[PDB]
Amino acid sequence: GFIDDSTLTGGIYYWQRERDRKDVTDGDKYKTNLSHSTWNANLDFQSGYAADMFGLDIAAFTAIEMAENGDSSHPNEIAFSKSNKAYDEDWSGDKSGISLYKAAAKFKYGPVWARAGYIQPTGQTLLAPHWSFMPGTYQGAEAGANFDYGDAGALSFSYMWTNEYKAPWHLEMDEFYQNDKTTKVDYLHSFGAKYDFKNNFVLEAAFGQAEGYIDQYFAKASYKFDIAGSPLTTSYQFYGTRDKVDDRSVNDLYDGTAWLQALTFGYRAADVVDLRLEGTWVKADGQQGYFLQRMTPTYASSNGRLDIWWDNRSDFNANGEKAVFFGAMYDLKNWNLPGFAIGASYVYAWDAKPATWQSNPDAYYDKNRTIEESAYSLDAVYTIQDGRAKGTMFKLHFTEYDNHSDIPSWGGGYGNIFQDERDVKFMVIAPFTIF
């Protein structure tokens, strides 16, 4: 039937983290950076469509701190930051709370669809939320269409407009601002599309804008062919960004177009090991010196689509940087341990340049310098195969990151690079269905 085609789901999440970082300015001491244990739990109601045209979605989640070390920095992004609004962030605490993260009317008419309210991007644009356990929330609306041409392929495109955002670690929405936190950005919007040729070749691209400030670009080619009866997946991705403020002020981020280009190769060997080989290439001349996939520069103020994620702490998005990643996920099912997996991954990055200019350079600022970053991580995963708690997943991740330079964190004209690090994450994820 219609709106009593509804569903009600949710989950309970546990997160325990210990991360420390090298302090080059205090005798190379590795010091406590993050140390906490936090709970999350959510509830998600999604209606059917009445007359196949009208629906309602409502969802909320809560964070409840258990443990926190005194020397832990903030925000840890799992709890709520003590600062409700992103542009008020002052880095001094975390707290418990309840946040309404979905609150939307949804519509369907023919091949057309729309959502308006408290929403996440779901179509073809380059707007995106941050993801903790739960996603961030935009205030705005999205509309799109899907046109199926059978074997000829299928086309879909969509448009999203928004004027406020909250990251999953913020209890309230905030408006958008330039890099100075005071010049107003009236809205973010984005149009994008996707063509599926039905031959395992897919094209996607999208254009975005932050009103009066930034133009953002996305493009991705995907292909899947079989080698030895198993799919080898491949893709080239292009991410670019431009601003409209070239006057050497605090708001001028990029000289000329900034971009990140990526190549992707994936393959499952012997139906038992997931294999990843990926590389990225970044250009970011100007004052910032690193690429951002989001159209607002301030931390947590918005987010954009980025299909590249290596879970090795660094962003590897510095001005000249080139980087390579290999990861292996070994399914232990043939040791008769189905649902256990173990993995390791490794990143090496070189040719990392700093910003091309600085208004307040520091002692380490050398415009022609290049540095290298590297990292490796180990992974252990277990999903409960059956019983009362079938689906419950336990996860343990360890990362060691090395900077390869004596430059203290955030210094030397590398605004998005921190010092050497060892990070350990343990999470439990326990879904549930009410309807």
Ligand X SMILES: CCCCCCCCCCCCO[C@@H]1O[C@H](CO)[C@@H](O[C@H]2O[C@H](CO)[C@@H](O)[C@H](O)[C@H]2O)[C@H](O)[C@H]1O
Stretch that binds ligand X, among 123-131, 167-175, 215-223, 258-266 (CB under 6 A): 167-175
Identified binder of ligand X from the candidate list 53, 100, 112, 337, rule CB under 6 A: 100
> Could you tell which of Pt ion, ligand X, none binds residue 373, using a CB distance below 5 to 8 A set by kind?
none
Rounded to an integer, what distance in angstroms lies between the CA atom of residue 157 and that of residue 166?
25
Stretch that binds Pt ion, among 9-17, 191-199, 235-243, 359-367 (CB under 5 A): 235-243
| Shortest distance in whole angstroms from residue 252 CB to Pt ion | 4
Q: How far is the CB of 24 from Pt ion (least distance, A)?
A: 9
**Please, which of residues 338-357 interact with ligand X by CB under 6 A?**
none
Q: Does residue 99 bind ligand X (CB under 6 A)?
A: yes
Q: Specify the residue, 21 or 115, whose C-beta has the smaller distance to ligand X.
A: 115
- Measured from each CB, the residue nearest to ligand X is 173
Decide: is 400 part of the binding site for Pt ion (CB under 5 A).
no
**Chosen from ligand X, Pt ion, none, partner binding at 402 (C-beta under 5 to 8 Å by type):** Pt ion
- Find the shortest distance in angstroms from Cβ 59 to ligand X: 9
Q: Which of Pt ion, ligand X, none sits in contact with 331, Cβ below 5 to 8 A by type? A: none
Candidates 172, 362, 366, 406: give the one binding ligand X (CB under 6 A).
172
Residue 252: contacted member of Pt ion, ligand X, none (CB under 5 to 8 Å, by partner type): Pt ion
Query: Which partner, Pt ion, ligand X, none, binds residue 269 by CB below 5 to 8 Å per kind?
Result: none
44 binds Pt ion (CB under 5 A): no
Tell me the CA distances in angstroms from 297 to 89, 93, 215, one per residue in order.
14, 22, 12
Of 66, 98, 269, 270, the residue at the interface with ligand X (CB under 6 A) is 98
Smallest gap, in angstroms, from Cβ of residue 173 to ligand X? 3
The rounded distance, in Å, linking the Cα atoms of 49 and 51 is 6
Please say which residue, 252 or 278, places its beta carbon nearer to Pt ion: 252
For ligand X, which is the closer residue by CB, 148 or 172? 172
Q: Kindly identify the residues of this chain, within the stretch 236-255, that bind Pt ion according to CB under 5 A.
A: 243, 246, 252
Of these partners, Pt ion, ligand X, none, which one is at the site of residue 38 (CB under 5 to 8 Å by kind)?
none
Q: Which residues bind Pt ion (CB under 5 A)?
A: 94, 243, 246, 252, 402-403, 420
Instruction: List interacting residues with ligand X (CB under 6 A).
Output: 60, 98-100, 171-173
